[PDB]
Nucleic acid binder design. Structure first.
Ligand SMILES: Nc1nc(=O)n([C@@H]2CS[C@H](COP(=O)(O)OP(=O)(O)OP(=O)(O)O)O2)cc1F
Ligand SMILES: [Ca+2]
Ligand SMILES: [Ca+2]
Ligand SMILES: [Ca+2]
Ligand SMILES: [Ca+2]
Ligand SMILES: [Ca+2]
Ligand SMILES: [Ca+2]
Ligand SMILES: [Ca+2]
Length: 333
DNA sequence: CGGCGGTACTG
DNA sequence: CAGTAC
DNA sequence: GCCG
């Protein structure tokens, strides 16, 4: 299936390195190049053939060929030494490249330097203490019980609540980095005020152990990012994301929350090429205009009762969640 | 060359 | 606003 | 990094 496996691995390493150093557009370019190589019907055999692939240009071709001809890749040996520390610190939830760079510049190089001397935000403290647990992907079966726990707690308040696990789970993966639960109610109204009760119920049984992003001052709270742990001996703490949306938003919210991230970006960039805007709330025939410039013209939602509607309105055929790794990847079936 | 998804918290 | 996240 |  992947005919250029030897080449992708090396480019990933390189990609990773730009990512932790904060060079994101460059990291973006690599990611796309890499998926394109993985998609290709055959080993790449010439520079020309490589350049012909969308997402692969001159610099990437040079490296691709260099690998194929000479077998390894020079540049992997000039990767700055800070990189693995930087990846280490960016693996703390709530710490990104800026924080990892600050930490590096004040001399920390291990998790101990962080624990014992770093200034940590509230979120980082939690990410640090669950560092290992949050690094481990969970099996699909743990995700199912996490989701059921949320669904039962919800359906105890209102049995008409719809709860669905999205993310990699809904794309059919075997393991999940974190569970993503989307809650709605078909009557258009009774999704309102749910979070207060749902979080309280989930806390009482001891299932939620820490909160990361949860603005509970707001009765119209839309999201919860926190930490759960299933009951029973030896269970790990897992990342849990819950969104509560109005039914009219369901299709767009389902699409967003199913992902993948690259898939959603490409869908969104497509919508904009066609004078629309795609968000987790809606698809909108929205457009700019600002007296010698551009701006906000919030341009009215197109109703999309299902995900198929969103695909149709963008000129695309429905894509099964399992085939939503990348938009530009066409699986046959 | 400039743009690269669109949005929600936290501090 | 900057940082980080989804 | 690549693309229009
Ligand atoms: N940057 C992102 N934009 C997105 O639109 N998403 C969307 C919203 S949540 C949905 C799933 O993303 P996750 O980050 O939980 O990633 P995942 O479920 O695909 O994979 P994993 O098993 O959780 O590692 O994708 C995620 C992003 F990280
Ligand atoms: Ca190309
Ligand atoms: Ca991080
Ligand atoms: Ca369910
Ligand atoms: Ca996930
Ligand atoms: Ca998630
Ligand atoms: Ca809070
Ligand atoms: Ca440039």
């Amino acid at each position: 299936t992947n005919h250029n496996l030897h080449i992708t691995e090396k480019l990933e390493v390189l990609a990773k390195a730009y990512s932790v150093q904060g060079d994101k557009w460059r990291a973006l370019g690599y990611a796309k190049a890499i998926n394109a190589l993985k998609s290709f019907h055959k080993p790449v055999t010439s520079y020309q053939e490589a350049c012909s692939i969308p997402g692969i240009g001159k610099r990437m071709a040079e490296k691709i060929i260099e690998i194929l001809e000479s077998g390894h890749l020079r540049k992997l040996d000039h990767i700055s030494e800070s990189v693995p520390v930087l990846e280490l610190f960016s693996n703390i939830w709530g710490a990104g490249t800026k924080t990892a760079q600050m930490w590096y510049q004040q001399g920390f190089r291990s998790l101990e330097d962080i624990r014992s001397q770093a200034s940590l935000t509230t979120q980082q403290a939690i990410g640090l203490k669950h560092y290992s647990d949050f690094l481990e992907r969970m099996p699909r079966e743990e995700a199912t019980e996490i989701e059921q726990t949320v669904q039962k707690a919800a359906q105890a308040f209102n049995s008409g609540l719809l709860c669905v696990a999205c993310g990699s789970y809904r794309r059919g993966k075997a393991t999940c980095g974190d569970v993503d639960v989307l809650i709605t109610h078909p009557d258009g109204r009774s999704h309102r005020g749910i979070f207060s009760r749902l979080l309280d119920s989930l806390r009482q049984e001891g299932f939620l152990t820490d909160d990361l992003v949860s603005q509970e001052e707001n009765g119209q709270q839309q999201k919860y990012l926190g930490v759960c742990r299933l009951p029973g001996p030896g269970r790990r703490h897992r990342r849990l994301d819950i969104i509560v949306v109005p039914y009219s938003e369901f299709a767009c919210a389902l699409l967003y929350f199913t992902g993948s991230a690259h898939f959603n970006r490409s869908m969104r960039a497509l919508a904009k090429t066609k004078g629309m805007s795609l968000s987790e709330h809606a698809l909108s025939t929205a457009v700019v205009r600002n007296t010698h410039g551009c701006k906000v013209g919030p341009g009215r939602v197109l109703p999309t009762p299902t995900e198929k509607d969103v695909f149709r309105l963008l000129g695309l055929p429905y894509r099964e969640p399992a085939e939503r790794d990348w938009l530009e990847h066409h699986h046959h079936h």
